[PDB]
Design an enzyme around this catalytic site. Structure first.
Site, PDB file in Angstrom:
ATOM      1  N   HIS A 177       0.832  -1.211  -0.045  1.00  0.00           N
ATOM      2  CA  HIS A 177       0.114   0.163   0.054  1.00  0.00           C
ATOM      3  C   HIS A 177       0.862   1.256  -0.032  1.00  0.00           C
ATOM      4  CE1 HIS A 177      -2.460  -3.129   2.250  1.00  0.00           C
ATOM      5  NE2 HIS A 177      -3.019  -2.994   1.149  1.00  0.00           N
ATOM      6  N   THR A 180      -5.953   7.464   7.468  1.00  0.00           N
ATOM      7  CA  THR A 180      -6.323   7.454   6.167  1.00  0.00           C
ATOM      8  C   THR A 180      -6.383   6.148   5.281  1.00  0.00           C
ATOM      9  OG1 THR A 180      -3.939   8.014   5.707  1.00  0.00           O
ATOM     10  CG2 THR A 180      -5.776   9.999   5.834  1.00  0.00           C
ATOM     11  N   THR A 181      -6.300   4.943   6.133  1.00  0.00           N
ATOM     12  CA  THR A 181      -6.450   3.931   5.399  1.00  0.00           C
ATOM     13  C   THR A 181      -6.975   2.922   6.557  1.00  0.00           C
ATOM     14  OG1 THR A 181      -4.123   3.180   6.412  1.00  0.00           O
ATOM     15  CG2 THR A 181      -4.454   3.700   4.078  1.00  0.00           C
ATOM     16  N   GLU A 221      -2.866  13.831   0.416  1.00  0.00           N
ATOM     17  CA  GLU A 221      -4.081  13.622   1.030  1.00  0.00           C
ATOM     18  C   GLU A 221      -5.026  14.769   1.342  1.00  0.00           C
ATOM     19  OE1 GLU A 221      -3.737   9.947   3.667  1.00  0.00           O
ATOM     20  OE2 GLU A 221      -4.426   9.348   1.594  1.00  0.00           O
TER      21      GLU A 221
END
Length: 257
Positions: free
Chosen positions: A61, A195-196, A103
């Site tokens: 990722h 954020t994941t 982001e």
């Protein structure tokens, strides 16, 4: 499995992690005009003189540099925080072009990449318990723009060959995170989430106002990484970023005027 593709992309995460549609989710767009300048905010205390980096790994990722957090080696204090937060790892988010990759956005402006230096609240014992609390982690976000080269980041740029495919890892001792910091420590802060996945809402986000510059060829090496594991079709690791989420019942305070 979640990812950044049209089929398992950020727009599908809710199906597995319902909290994706939560109340305090990250990232968000920082509107510099309606951000409430708070003057009761003590200034950041960042002490990375004793930091111990250890490994770097491609997790499929993003890539992570990990530090030894078995003791207060590199801690974050000051700012809106209460207590010591210790550095456990740092990672990046980048785009396939120079005009996207961050982001968080500032007044809707996207940066080439964004760094997150992750820290957990030591009053909680371990990272696993820390993510269970509304004040568990303190993430320090730094934007990267493309211009001159950041010398202190090159060490990281070189080892990337060793961890090209999902799963590979490599020793990475003696790395000083102080070389990634910008000159000024003015910031914006607000409560949010990871954020994941698992997208837990345990973060106090501290986004530095001032970005660092990296050369094109420096960021260009971030794009040669692979989402895929070894011996699988090559899926280049680019655009591993989640889009901005609705701010809701939140207020972004700023430590400067």
């Amino acid at each position: 499995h979640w990812g950044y593709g049209k089929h398992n992309g950020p727009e599908h995460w809710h199906k597995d992690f319902p909290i994706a549609k939560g109340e305090r989710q990250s990232p968000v767009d920082i509107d510099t005009h309606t951000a409430k300048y708070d003057p009761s905010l003590k200034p950041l205390s960042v002490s990375y003189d004793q930091a111990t980096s250890l490994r770097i790994l491609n997790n499929g990722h993003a890539f992570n540099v990990e530090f030894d957090d078995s003791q207060d080696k590199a801690v974050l204090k000051g700012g809106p925080l209460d207590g010591t937060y210790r550095l456990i790892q740092f990672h990046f988010h980048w785009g396939s072009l120079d005009g996207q990759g961050s982001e968080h956005t500032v007044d809707k402006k996207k940066y080439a990449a964004q760094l997150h230096l992750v820290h957990w609240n030591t009053k909680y014992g371990d990272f696993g318990k820390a993510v269970q609390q509304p004040d568990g982690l303190a993430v320090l976000g730094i934007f990267l723009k493309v211009g001159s080269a950041k010398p202190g980041l090159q060490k990281v740029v070189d080892v990337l060959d060793s961890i090209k495919t999902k799963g590979k890892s490599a020793d990475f001792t003696n790395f000083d995170p102080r070389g990634l910091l910008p000159e000024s420590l003015d910031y914006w802060t607000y409560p949010g989430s990871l954020t994941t996945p698992p997208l837990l809402e345990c973060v106090t986000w501290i986004v530095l106002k001032e970005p660092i510059s990296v050369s094109s060829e420096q960021v260009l090496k971030f794009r040669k990484l692979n989402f895929n594991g070894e011996g699988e079709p090559e899926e280049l690791m680019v655009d591993n970023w989640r889009p901005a989420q609705p701010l809701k019942n939140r207020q972004i305070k700023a430590s400067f005027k």
